[PDB]
């Protein structure tokens, strides 16, 4: 849509439709910016919620961090409930304070992600092969432990020829080991995830 | 109110005969309050009996109590104000909190009148002696309106409109509209209430005018004020004014101009008097004497003692002797709060100890203010005799003494302290304090 608007802006009778073209372009740029921030903040929040809910005994070691993320998560839950109650693109575009609220949420989630180095080092001590995984990628791996959808793009860093793994329909039993050229080996007995 | 009834009862609309019987009674009630709201109880009773004696409107069959004691119910019949609020039992935790208000006849009546005048966003002025309750009444009647947000303002002798302009710069914003400039609070959908606390005290000029009162009158009547920076008329959007003031016969106060006073209704709040005071603080005393169950029976005599000594001191020391001789229910509230704070950590105390706390608080409230040794001796002797009058068969020597001191320095709690031990402790602490 933005490309088409910019194409018809140049030629040939743009002068009569100028104000409508500017309004269209402005609202398109605004929704582009809002959703560009939105995809990143949702991608951050999904693994932050995973790591702070599925993993336990973190409040006894980072109480202020856990309380801060609990408050931020309740705020995000309320905002997403409002978005669910207003599923219109124009409505979410014109929600008052959405841009600054989402920018502040991105900044706070970034700070929370930054303040996790000691816990990440403890996890790396727990599993030896996590030493070859970065901080953000390790955070995503821990947060999306139950999902098992983003582990296929991270297994190649940990292992030698294990590019990905094959799963069942329930996505709760590992069936084998898959390489990057399609060569696969079948387990003698699976693992009970 | 009729429209509210119509909205609340969609299946049964507002009938004509009920509307007539409601509106006639409300007209009598509104005439009474609008014409004698700024006068004493005797004068409003006189106006009520005059209306009852001249005008043929149905009225309650009240042999003694005035018509202003009654409320026009929405169903169209008179209802007493006293039956609205019963005896309440405030919790021990908030026994003298700054926001607790134990309901009373005058409190409920003034709250209803304030709500009526504040729902229409009409400016008003609360008049009465200091400490009578003209800020608790406004705040209690305005806590029932979530739309309203209070902004405190304390007028002085050298008050000039720049105080109002600084308040507007902080709490509101200027915006430009095609119709002109309007001024509105930054909180969207909220009404701002400016509570000017000493509205008489702005200094009257040589030619009988007050700049602040003229400014407020211009804003109330013309709906806006000129902005002196660019000489541009600035309109107001959601702003009202509420004034509190002592009577204009007080030593520092001046009478407001008639052009300003044309717009602001004035309601006169007086001191509660003895019969209201005894209940209005016996509730607090009964709540307070639950920390120590053995002191439960010593609540009515204690409240009578506080009320009686406060009345005696207020009658004795007046404004004409010294400028600061102002005694109000603020002193009783601080009395209850002091006894509660001295009783909270103890949870075991005999009646002599309770009387000692009561006498120490009486001293610290009614004797530190005084100037002359004769007045101080009068307060000491009268504290002793009021305590002996209201508390017979008590250990006078064990409950009263010449020093009577309380401190939390030598003890963890707030318990009485011996003078010699206190002197030794202060000497040692001064030895430490010289080097620090």
């Amino acid at each position: 849509h933005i490309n088409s608007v910019s194409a018809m802006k140049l030629s040939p009778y743009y002068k009569v439709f100028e104000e409508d073209a500017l309004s269209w372009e402005d609202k398109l740029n605004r929704i582009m910016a809002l959703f560009d921030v939105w995809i990143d903040v949702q991608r951050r929040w999904v693994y932050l919620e995973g790591i702070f809910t599925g993993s336990a005994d973190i409040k006894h070691l980072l109480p202020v961090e856990t309380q801060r993320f609990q408050s931020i998560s309740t705020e995000f839950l309320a905002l997403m409930k409002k978005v669910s109650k207003s599923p219109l693109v124009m409505d979410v575009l014109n929600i008052q304070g959405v841009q600054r609220s989402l920018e502040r949420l991105a900044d706070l989630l970034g700070k929370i992600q930054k303040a996790l180095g000691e816990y990440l080092e403890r996890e790396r001590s727990s599993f030896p092969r996590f030493y070859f995984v970065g901080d953000e990628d390790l955070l995503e791996i821990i947060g999306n432990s139950k999902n098992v959808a983003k582990l296929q793009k991270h297994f190649k860093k940990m292992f030698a020829g294990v590019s990905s793994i094959i799963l069942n329909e329930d996505n709760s039993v590992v069936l084998g080991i898959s390489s990057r050229e399609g060569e696969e080996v079948m387990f003698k007995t699976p693992v009970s995830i | 109110n009729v429209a509210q009834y119509n909205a609340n009862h969609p299946d049964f609309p507002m009938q004509i005969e009920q509307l007539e019987r409601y509106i006639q009674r409300y007209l009598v009630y509104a005439i009474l309050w609008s014409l004698s709201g700024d006068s004493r109880l005797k004068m409003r009773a006189e106006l009520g009996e005059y209306i009852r004696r001249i005008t043929t409107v149905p009225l309650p069959t009240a042999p003694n109590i005035p018509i202003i004691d009654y409320e026009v119910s929405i169903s169209g019949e008179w209802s007493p104000w006293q039956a609205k609020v019963p005896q309440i039992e405030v919790e021990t935790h908030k026994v003298a909190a700054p926001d607790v208000v134990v309901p009373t006849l005058d409190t409920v009546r003034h709250e209803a009148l304030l709500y009526t005048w504040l729902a229409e966003h009409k400016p008003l002025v609360l008049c009465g002696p200091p400490g009578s309750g003209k800020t608790m009444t406004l705040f209690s009647a305005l806590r029932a309106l979530p739309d309203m947000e209070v902004v405190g303002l304390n007028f002085s002798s050298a008050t000039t409109p720049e105080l109002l302009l600084k308040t507007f710069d902080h709490y509101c914003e200027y915006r430009r509209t095609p119709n002109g400039v309007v001024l509105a609070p930054v909180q969207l959908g909220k009404w701002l209430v400016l509570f000017c606390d000493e509205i008489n005290l702005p200094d009257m000029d040589k030619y009988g005018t007050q700049r602040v009162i003229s400014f407020i009158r211009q804003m109330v009547e013309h709906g806006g004020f000129y902005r002196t920076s660019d000489q541009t008329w600035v309109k107001l959007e959601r702003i009202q004014f509420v004034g509190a003031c002592n009577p204009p016969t007080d030593p520092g106060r001046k009478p407001l101009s008639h052009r300003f006073l044309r717009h602001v209704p004035v309601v006169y709040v007086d001191y509660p008097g003895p019969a209201s005071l005894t209940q209005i603080y016996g509730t607090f005393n009964r709540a307070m004497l639950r920390l120590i169950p053995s002191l439960r029976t010593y609540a009515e005599p204690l409240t009578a003692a506080m009320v009686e000594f406060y009345t005696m001191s207020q009658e004795r020391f007046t404004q004409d002797t010294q400028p600061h001789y102002i005694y109000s229910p603020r002193e009783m509230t601080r009395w209850v709060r002091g006894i509660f704070e001295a009783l909270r950590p103890l949870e075991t105390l005999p009646v002599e100890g309770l009387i000692r706390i009561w006498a120490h608080e009486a001293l610290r409230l009614f004797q530190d203010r005084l100037v002359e040794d004769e007045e101080r001796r009068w307060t000491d002797e009268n504290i002793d005799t009021v305590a002996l009058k209201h508390f017979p068969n008590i250990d006078r020597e064990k409950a009263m003494s010449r020093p009577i001191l309380y401190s939390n320095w030598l003890s963890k709690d707030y318990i009485p302290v011996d003078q010699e031990e206190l002197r030794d402790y202060v000497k040692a602490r001064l030895k430490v304090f010289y080097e620090e």
Partner: protein, 49 residues
């Protein structure tokens, strides 16, 4: 000193205009509200100009 408050005196002098009192009040308010510091603000009658 016994109660742990920090004593503040404005230390008035000559040519002490209203801006200096505003600055002293600002510093007292900042210390007392932003930094949770209990302050005893002792002010004399000769300090009022």
């Amino acid at each position: 000193w016994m109660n742990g408050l920090s004593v503040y005196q404005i230390k008035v002098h000559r040519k002490y205009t209203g801006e200096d009192f505003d600055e002293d009040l600002r510093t007292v308010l900042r210390r007392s509200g932003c930094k949770n510091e209990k302050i005893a603000f002792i002010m004399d009658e000769s300090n009022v100009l």
